[PDB]
Amino acid sequence: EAFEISDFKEHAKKKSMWAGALNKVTISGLMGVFTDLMALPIHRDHCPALLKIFDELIVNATDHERACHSKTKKVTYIKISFDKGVFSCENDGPGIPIAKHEQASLIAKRDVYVPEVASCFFLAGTNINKAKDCIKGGTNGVGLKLAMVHSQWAILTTADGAQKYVQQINQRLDIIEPPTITPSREMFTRIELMPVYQELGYAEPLSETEQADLSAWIYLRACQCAAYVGKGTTIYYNDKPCRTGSVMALAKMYTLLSAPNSTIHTATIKADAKPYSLHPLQVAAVVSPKFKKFEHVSIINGVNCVKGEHVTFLKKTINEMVIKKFQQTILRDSCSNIFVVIVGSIPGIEWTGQRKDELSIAENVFKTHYSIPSSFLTSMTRSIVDILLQSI
Numbered sequence: 001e002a003f004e005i006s007d008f009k010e011h012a013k014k015k016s017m018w019a020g021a022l023n024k025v026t027i028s029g030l031m032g033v034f035t036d037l038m039a040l041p042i043h044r045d046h047c048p049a050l051l052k053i054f055d056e057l058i059v060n061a062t063d064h065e066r067a068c069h070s071k072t073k074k075v076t077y078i079k080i081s082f083d084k085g086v087f088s089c090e091n092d093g094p095g096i097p098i099a100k101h102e103q104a105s106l107i108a109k110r111d112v113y114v115p116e117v118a119s120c121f122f123l124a125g126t127n128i129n130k131a132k133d134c135i136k137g138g139t140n141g142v143g144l145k146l147a148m149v150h151s152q153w154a155i156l157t158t159a160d161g162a163q164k165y166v167q168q169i170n171q172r173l174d175i176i177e178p179p180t181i182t183p184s185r186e187m188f189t190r191i192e193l194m195p196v197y198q199e200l201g202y203a204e205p206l207s208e209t210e211q212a213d214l215s216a217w218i219y220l221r222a223c224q225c226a227a228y229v230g231k232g233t234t235i236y237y238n239d240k241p242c243r244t245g246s247v248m249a250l251a252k253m254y255t256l257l258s259a260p261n262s263t264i265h266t267a268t269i270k271a272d273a274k275p276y277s278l279h280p281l282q283v284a285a286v287v288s289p290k291f292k293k294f295e296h297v298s299i300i301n302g303v304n305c306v307k308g309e310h311v312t313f314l315k316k317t318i319n320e321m322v323i324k325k326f327q328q329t330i331l332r333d334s335c336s337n338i339f340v341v342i343v344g345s346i347p348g349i350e351w352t353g354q355r356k357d358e359l360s361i362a363e364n365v366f367k368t369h370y371s372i373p374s375s376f377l378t379s380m381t382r383s384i385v386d387i388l389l390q391s392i
């Protein structure tokens, strides 16, 4: 028919490329935390874009944590809330600067302050020009805008130690209210919003099962955050601390139902050269005959990554050992009883899309730079070969 020209807002309300499907679909490997913390599958369809806007706020807070972990004022908390359908994320550390943005003001022909650029201008942020070694997850300058475009109402609040800035952003970014600016001694950034649940396939208000599923998924996402952030940061979900600060605790949570009292093989995968040497990768793995296929949970640069060559590196290395030790005794066969958690930062990665589901890298990065400790390989191989010798 006709050739139409869209704007960002209308395009994002219609197109799955930005955040995933805009209706409920079957999400492979969808999990949530249920309370002992136990991660369990959610066998109901859910809207990927809805889960992504929660993710975009959580990764923004994790990014600020990494950015500040060496400065005077660090991020000491990330507080995530979900109640009556309202989602919020708050972190301390330096606020978004409360200042006029000259370029944005000229574009919009009115006064625009920096926090309005951060929340309302597509393709805008502090990572548009991104260093080659940056390990923040943010890159595109769209994540916070997508959260606004999928919100019936939203409130951005930020304080910089001298002033507080409050701005309402309503009706899927159609209405940007002028901000309120007052003196303040607080220092934080808070986003609070109500998603357009009904447009994304949910009930108005959330049904009992929808509410329980979403709360479980957010709780697990906060727990994944807690394993990734630095030592001086606490993550809260509905004011309870998420006490899963290690890959070991995450591995336990995922295997508590299926392999209780399991042995957890641990490793720190290290590199000798900067920038890789700044960024150890923490690994915890469980080997059980009860597991039916290889599975991993990877939190890389604060993002839940479902595919990447970092996984392949580990699998290929274990497989090599398993084949040798199996042959002396007598890839799918060698790894199908493994569950592994990998958490850490990797400099210089790219992605396959806005959702950051798959990281993109040369496999030689791991061959050249990283080393998997022999004690971990030996102990994993012993456990895997025993399972294999049973079947025989």
Ligand SMILES: Nc1ncnc2c1ncn2[C@@H]1O[C@H](COP(=O)(O)OP(=O)(O)O)[C@@H](O)[C@H]1O
Residues within 6 Å of the ligand: 056, 060, 061, 064, 091, 094, 095, 096, 118, 119, 124, 125, 126, 127, 128, 137, 138, 139, 140, 141, 142, 143, 144, 145, 189
């Ligand atoms: N919780 C937060 N704390 C501090 N700054 C934030 C926060 N969330 C967003 N920002 C700022 O707003 C900008 C826009 O966020 P976003 O649209 O997600 O882009 P990015 O791709 O940079 O993450 C970010 O680059 C960052 O500078």
Ligand SMILES: [Mg+2]
Residues within 6 Å of the ligand: 056, 059, 060, 137, 138, 139, 142, 143, 144
């Ligand atoms: Mg972002």
